[PDB]
Design a protein around this ligand. Structure first.
Ligand SMILES: *CCC(=O)N1CCCC[C@@H]1c1cncn1C
Length: 342
């Protein structure tokens, strides 16, 4: 077996000429030369089988990415594992290699207004398909937006995705949450489990703001600080928006704060296109019921050069793991990956 950094990275004779990339969210990832399709590919090694929560996220991603087929969503090209459940310890997921990502690009490149527009279009076009499948991504951020040399954009990492469940979204105040802090909507900290499509639109809003200035807009240093940063820019919520929060601990926390003024977007982003700021405002709306939806966002004047609903496909087949034990989830991972065996 191929070895990388002194660890097994056993991708078989199909995949040769390995090169270390890094230790991605759930293990090692390498590029490799695909001897069948004659291109370099990305391969991540997953070792989830000792833990039920890791089985769950691995299975979630595999099931979702195998069903989805969309230009702005990363596919799965191939899955490598042992021929039997007993011998299966690792799974290698093979995907199109993408030269960079929006996190890397934002750390050293100024984006033109045309690049911002085109990136936002592609994010929303992918997101339209995801939401049309009744799925929430729940971890949109620059590092999950892959880009190739011609700036084609693909959304990555469906490990934290869920089927939407708006009727069960309500929870109490300061309920712990899994997804990345700077891109978390204000309601996560107040009264929401992140089971509605509006949680993804907030994340896209944060990404848009980050494209405009190369700095995260709400860089919270820990959990409740994130809400401090959001309110610092949006200002104090209105009475109507407070009345939408029935939970008393969350309501009374917001009422306890001194008045904070809205910072105008054109002062924060003096070089931005005014249409980009109007769409930004609508994505970063405090009240998630008033927040713009993905299809409205595509139809916004900022994106008029690209908007074409007939070329913005939806899923044909929209989508309990939570308490299946890990033994059962290994079997389901084995089954979900069987089509890639000879
Ligand atoms: C979800 C992000 C991810 O898997 N990658 C981006 C960072 C490098 C490794 C991954 C990559 C590169 N090209 C394609 N893919 C999936």
């Amino acid at each position: 077996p191929e070895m990388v950094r002194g660890q097994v990275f056993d991708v078989g004779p199909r995949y040769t000429n390995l090169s270390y990339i890094g230790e991605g969210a759930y293990g090692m990832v390498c590029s490799a030369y695909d001897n069948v399709n004659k291109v370099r590919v990305a391969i991540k090694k997953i070792s989830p089988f000792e833990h039920q929560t890791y089985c769950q996220r691995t299975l979630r991603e595999i099931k979702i990415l195998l069903r989805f087929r969309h230009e702005n969503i990363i596919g799965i090209n191939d899955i490598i594992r042992a021929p039997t459940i007993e011998q299966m310890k690792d799974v290698y997921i093979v995907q199109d290699l993408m030269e960079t990502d929006l996190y890397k690009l934002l750390k050293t490149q100024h984006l033109s207004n045309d690049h911002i527009c085109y990136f936002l279009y592609q994010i929303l076009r992918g997101l339209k398909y995801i939401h049309s499948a009744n799925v929430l991504h729940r971890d949109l951020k620059p590092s999950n937006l892959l880009l190739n040399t011609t700036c084609d954009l693909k959304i990555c990492d469906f490990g934290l995705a869920r089927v939407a469940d708006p009727d069960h979204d309500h929870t109490g105040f300061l309920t712990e949450y899994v997804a990345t802090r700077w891109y978390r909507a204000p309601e996560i900290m107040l009264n929401s489990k992140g089971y509605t499509k509006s949680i993804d639109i907030w994340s896209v809003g944060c990404i848009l703001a980050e494209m405009l200035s190369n700095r995260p807009i709400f860089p919270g240093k820990h959990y409740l600080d994130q809400l401090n940063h959001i309110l610092g820019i949006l200002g104090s919520p209105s009475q109507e928006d407070l009345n939408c929060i029935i939970n008393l601990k969350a309501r009374n926390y917001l009422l306890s704060l001194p008045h904070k003024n809205k910072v105008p977007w054109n002062r924060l982003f003096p070089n931005a296109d005014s249409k980009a700021l109007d769409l930004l405002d609508k994505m970063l709306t405090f009240n998630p019921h008033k927040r713009i939806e993905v299809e409205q966002a595509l139809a916004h004047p900022y994106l008029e050069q690209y908007y074409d609903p007939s070329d913005e496909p939806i899923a044909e087949a929209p989508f309990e793991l939570d308490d299946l034990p890990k033994e059962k989830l290994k079997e389901l991972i084995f089954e979900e990956t069987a089509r890639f065996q000879p």
